[PDB]
RNA sequence: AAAAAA
RNA sequence: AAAAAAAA
RNA sequence: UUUUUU
RNA sequence: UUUUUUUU
RNA sequence: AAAAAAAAAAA
RNA sequence: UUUUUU
RNA sequence: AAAAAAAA
RNA sequence: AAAAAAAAA
RNA sequence: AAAAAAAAA
RNA sequence: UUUUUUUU
RNA sequence: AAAAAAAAAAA
RNA sequence: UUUUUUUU
RNA sequence: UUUUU
RNA sequence: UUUUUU
């Protein structure tokens, strides 16, 4: 309600960190070709187009995707991610196909608690398969 | 009451002539393929808009859609940057269409704090899209 | 705390929009008036970029005040008269208010009843206005459109 | 009760208006021939005999119809209005019959409040059409 | 509500008067001359500028005053009103005076029920004195 | 409830009204060019497609327009609206956008009462812009 | 109750009618003979008089009749109704007899909704008898 | 936006006033203006509620 | 609460 | 209690 | 209680 | 309350 | 017990 | 509440 | 909540 | 009914 | 989203 | 609600 | 809260 | 039981 | 109440 | 309830 500076009785020196960790949700895109599994790099995480390079490690949590481009003719779209880890790889392939041709497919997993650890630029994060050329990402994750 | 009926009007009020006028103004914009556009303040004055007597404006949000269809293949999407003279912004308020028919969307608020005069001269944000118009509508104040 | 920062709107689908919307207003003018002589306020003087309204071209009257705006004769008291018209048919009636000040103005004023709103042009007239006083000034409560 | 003058402490000069509005139901007759419409002229309510010869306009709000004179021979009354505005002739016929030879005829119809405009003597009420030779009529109105 | 005429099951012929009553305030003025009463006629009441030429009989309820011109110099406004019957005159003076010399002075006289009979043209209500050279008058009554 | 005919003890003879009102949603279509606005008449709202062909006069209440064919490559529908009144042309512009190109554009407004007179065949009601050669109208109305 | 004009949000395009049903309650008089039954055909319903001239088929509800013209001399007047079907004609004479001379004679009859069947012009409603020439109907039916 | 107040007593003062939104509460220095003024008397007496820092 | 219909 | 004729 | 409007 | 119906 | 009828001049 | 009456 | 300047 | 601005008016 | 901001009673 | 105080 | 005094013209 | 940036 | 959530 | 007064 003050129009105008006021004065803080500031006291000791506190704890400070120039270099905190953001949680964010990082929408970025990928090229697919067809029958062909891609495996997303974490290290697309990390860039000045999402005020990230700064960071080495991500805790990724969730995991969702688009079919970013039409698919073929007469088909409807349709995305696969199949969850990738260091400690070992799954073989789930959640799934999601388009009921209508001009509308996007979509599908996404959560990482559970106890398998979110901290990932690199050089790890994978899951394999993406489609029908369409290019798959829209959106990655729910923890810099640190 | 079906008639006329006399006001026992008193003192003569105050009186302003040329008042404000909090208005959502709609206006388009031509984008370029991979090229932000600044819009222009200016477009907000206009007889078309009854506003052309106004010389400045305050902003409190803008709202964008992709005016027309997008690339072959391709779904439509809407980009805004949010421009102030004390500082330009760096958020790339982005919103995407899922059907490749229907338009995209997207738009931002200004705080109280940011929420100055802007005259014609000035720009309010930074469009991009894949397609080649995009419908603003703007929701200000004139004064 | 409010928001220091611009934050994202989550829009949809294109609203129905409109760029030239209506505008209720009170506009104030002043109209020079002649001793024992009515004069026939025009519609007209309601548009005008004076108001910002040069851009309509009908009106719907809601109540119109008036007061005097200079002087009265030596003498004699302010006063002033109002006799509404309308097109489908001009009253008859004088609603008058004077000054119990010589040095203060007289004021008086009038509703229009919703069924006697309708449109009105520029070249239409609003109401006949007698004074002792060789200007009048006019307060008219309006919608435009 | 006071049975002597008393003084108003009167203060300053109120707002006044020698020629002030009237609500009023005017009686007066039209004259009506067989199978013949008589449009009621608005000028007839300005008269003299009403003390309205001051008004140059009237709004009116309803309007009541009764047979004045015998019907013909072997005939039951009958009356009919068919409401006339200047923005669109209506073309509505309400009629009332008499269930009794010697009794009047009457019929009536209201005027919604988004036609309440003006009417000056040049235009016209409503059309009248009925078997008996006159017609008295009620007209609701407010001079102004 | 209602966009559209709609009918009225009138019935008998009412009781009807083209020639009601009217309760009203005239507004009027009257040129008065310093020392000298002036006698303010009941004919001033019946005139087209108010509407009621059409009257001969009133019936005056209650009568205000109000000074029309500026005072003397030097003066204070002040005016009187002296009430007047047919059946007997009354000696009261009714006297209300101005507090500013720029504004004007006021009163007025409330007659009792068992005064209020009618009066025609020729009669008069009441004698005004006022060092101002106009009076304004607003007379309540029941023209009849 | 009954299976046969059964007696009504009718009384005096009723009011009746042959022709009466009607509250109506009437539909229809116009062609409109490019760029050029189209009046749209009143007439076409009388008419034996609607059963309204014995009526002269017509009280609308609001318009309500579609576009009735697709619109030009590349380009989302869209139709504007411009009130048109006797007593005074608006210049407000209601417009309605499509946001998908195979969906169709639509938009209306409401008649306030005070402006809710009535129109014969030679009025219009209001001009429609649109890049679609053809719009579709829904006009709710009162014909009387 | 604005006083301008304001924007509907329309949306989808409706469901449409042009040429709706009605419920009508239709005047109309039938000349009869004396001795002799008159069977009333219900293409009289049918006409642009009633607004009705876009119908070919109704469904009656109800039927009631007033002797129209003054009766024989010394005689009280009636009347009566026969309900006639397509699926088989009644043989029902709800009869009315006035107790004064110079009033009308009145009877109607209700039609149950297991026999509110459609009826087209070439079809009969009822036989009328009466010892009054003509005889005035109000039917109370549902065009379709 | 002209905001206007007239007298109803010549002898009277006129008087107008307007109240600046928080959203344009900034400082201003002494080479800056608050608002022209407009009127018939050759003066005009002001009282502005500011917050001096 | 609007129009037509015991 | 619905339907029919009656019925203070 | 029904039908158009809503 | 004369004639008909109404899930046993 | 919020404990009888008014009007005229001065609170 | 003072005070002058039916 | 007392005091100061402001303040519907 | 979580992290990164604050843990006390 | 069901209360408020600007102009008006 | 801008500047001061008020028993820890 | 069954939420202030009447009369004149039109319900 | 104050609220504000970003999170499925 | 018009405009704007 | 509209509306015209003390
Ligand atoms: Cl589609
Ligand atoms: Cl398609
Ligand atoms: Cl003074
Ligand atoms: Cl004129
Ligand atoms: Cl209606
Ligand atoms: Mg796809
Ligand atoms: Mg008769
Ligand atoms: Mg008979």
Redesign the pocket.
Known sequence: ????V??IRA?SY?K??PT??????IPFEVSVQSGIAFKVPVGSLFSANFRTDSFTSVTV??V?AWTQLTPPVNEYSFVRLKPLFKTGDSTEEFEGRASNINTRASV?Y?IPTNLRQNTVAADNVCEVRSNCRQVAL?I?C?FN
Chains 1, 4, 5, 6, 7 share one sequence.
């Open positions: 309600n003050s129009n105008v006021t004065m006291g506190p400070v960190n905190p960790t953001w949680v964010r949700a949590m969730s969702r996404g959560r959106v729910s923890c």
